[PDB]
Design a binder for this molecule. Structure first.
Ligand code: HEM
Ligand SMILES: CCCCCCCCCCCCCCCC(=O)O
Ligand code: NI
Ligand code: NI
Ligand code: NI
Ligand code: NI
Length: 460
């Protein structure tokens, strides 16, 4: 059967574009998806795309045989920041597979074990910051989580210490990065993007990128110092070669991968930890159960690699946080050839799709009517999940390469947090999600009372 696709309000020649005149576009698309269902067509000037919400359709979309990764109009703009790095590359581009085969070992199981000691190093610093707060002080959660995840990838991946916890205002890299990423997101709303009204937006974007590359200059210059016994993500960028081609990365592409992993390797993990702690203080019984698991397993002054993989409820808690609000909320696709989607929606070649991940994770077909509630107990048995129903890390060979890096870090930090502190919703925070392509709760503050359990490190 062939069915016609529902389409939201059209505003003449701008088509659907004025519908996204909000600083919360993903959440607006969720509102739309509620009123139109599993799929709807979205039209902008020059561009058309189809948003998906149902596990049924989306599981067909993840067929690598039928569909390859498309670059969103978002990603085409982020490409101005990250070039042809792993995230913003075409699959058919010759720098993807190259950098993929070169860098994939950096996220192997034996690689991950090397990162732990450094993950703890920055984790210790976060814990000790909260341990040293005075009585009348609030914890700006997403701000401290950003400090944590930036230093982690900065140290694990490049042996470079941002020293975020030694700073008042965010590191100049964070400031420029957000503005740069805010531009790409806000740029999607501009009929005539080259109208000189935006020449100011183009000038600040230039500055932001100048700052970020100045930091990359620091990282490269500091490695050639040296910089010797290191076998981290940066080492493989410089010395490693692609098997198929026998070629290393260029002068240019290397810089792009650094920018890529500095952004991608922290921004969504900052959001995950922020969302996770938010739900825990909004569901204290879940908080209790989780904090009880933390007290049970974390028996040494600092967690071991073995212990972090024993915290499965903490891992469950994070998955459930990734379910309700996937910090990387969407990824695009295109049909490799002509086909029909869901056996009822004909697709031409070159047609773009959008996997609306938050709406996907809300498919009542898979999780029940119990959707909007926060229950980590959904993930007690992973094999009970009709997969392609839970994809917070994308799909296929273009799925998140740092998925295990993220979850291990997050579980570790969240674990140490529960072991060492109790938490009170000090301001009774109503959830306010800020969009910057990625998702993150904004203005969310807490109070932390110390359980008087000391530390003692640090290995590496
Ligand atoms: C909660 C944390 C994270 C989430 C939710 C997340 C989400 C995602 C998603 C949805 C994609 C697919 C993008 C697309 O298909 O268009 C992706 C790809 C990617 N992620 Fe992440 N990510 C996280 C953490 C990380 C970390 C920690 C790293 C690196 C240390 C990382 C690096 C990358 C890279 C390099 C790609 C593209 C690789 C390729 O396609 O070849 N991400 N991620
Ligand atoms: C270095 C790479 C950074 C890119 C990371 C951001 C990608 C996460 C998913 C965002 C997709 C777009 C969602 C909001 C925009 C929209 O579709 O209206
Ligand atoms: Ni107060
Ligand atoms: Ni410079
Ligand atoms: Ni190696
Ligand atoms: Ni055709």
């Amino acid at each position: 059967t062939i069915k016609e696709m529902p389409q939201p309000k059209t505003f003449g020649e701008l088509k659907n574009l004025p519908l996204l005149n909000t600083d919360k576009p993903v959440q607006a698309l969720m509102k739309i998806a509620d009123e139109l269902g599993e799929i709807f067509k979205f039209e902008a000037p020059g561009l058309v795309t189809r948003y998906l919400s149902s596990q049924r359709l989306i599981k067909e979309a993840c067929d690598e045989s039928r569909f390859d990764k498309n670059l969103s109009q978002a990603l085409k703009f982020v490409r101005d920041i990250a070039g042809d790095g792993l995230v913003t590359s075409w699959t058919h581009e010759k720098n993807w597979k190259k950098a993929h085969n070169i860098l994939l070992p950096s996220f192997s199981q034996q690689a991950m074990k090397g990162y732990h000691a450094m993950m703890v190093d920055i984790a210790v610093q976060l814990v000790q910051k909260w341990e040293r707060l005075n009585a009348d002080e609030h914890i700006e959660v997403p701000e401290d989580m950003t400090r944590l995840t930036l230093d982690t990838i900065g140290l694990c991946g490049f042996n470079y210490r941002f020293n975020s916890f030694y700073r008042d205002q965010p590191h100049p890299f964070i400031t420029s990065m957000v503005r740069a990423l805010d531009e790409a997101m806000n740029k999607q709303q501009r009929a005539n993007p080259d109208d000189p009204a935006y020449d100011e937006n183009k000038r600040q974007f230039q500055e932001d990128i100048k700052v970020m590359n100045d930091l990359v200059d620091k990282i490269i210059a500091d490695r050639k110092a040296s910089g010797e016994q290191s076998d981290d993500l940066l080492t493989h960028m410089l010395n490693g070669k692609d098997p198929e081609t026998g070629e290393p990365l260029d002068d240019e592409n290397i810089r792009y991968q650094i920018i890529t992993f500095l952004i991608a390797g922290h921004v969504t993990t900052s959001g995950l930890l922020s969302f996770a702690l938010y739900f825990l203080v909004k569901n204290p019984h879940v908080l209790q159960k989780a904090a009880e698991e933390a007290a049970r397993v974390l028996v040494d002054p600092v967690p071991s690699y073995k212990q972090v993989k024993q915290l499965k409820y903490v891992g469950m808690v994070l998955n459930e946080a990734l379910r309700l609000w996937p910090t990387a909320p969407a990824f695009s696709l295109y049909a490799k050839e002509d086909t029909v989607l869901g056996g009822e929606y004909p697709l031409e070649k070159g047609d773009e799709l959008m996997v609306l991940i938050p709406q996907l994770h809300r498919d009542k077909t898979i999780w029940g009517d119990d959707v909007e509630e926060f229950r980590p107990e959904r993930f007690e048995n992973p094999s009970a999940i009709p997969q392609h129903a839970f994809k917070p890390f994308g799909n296929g060979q273009r799925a998140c390469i740092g998925q295990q890096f993220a979850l291990h870090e997050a579980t570790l930090v969240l674990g140490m947090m529960l072991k060492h502190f109790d938490f009170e919703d000090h301001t009774n925070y109503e959830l306010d999600i800020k969009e910057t392509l990625t998702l993150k709760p904004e203005g969310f503050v807490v109070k932390a009372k110390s359980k008087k359990i000391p530390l003692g490190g640090i290995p590496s």
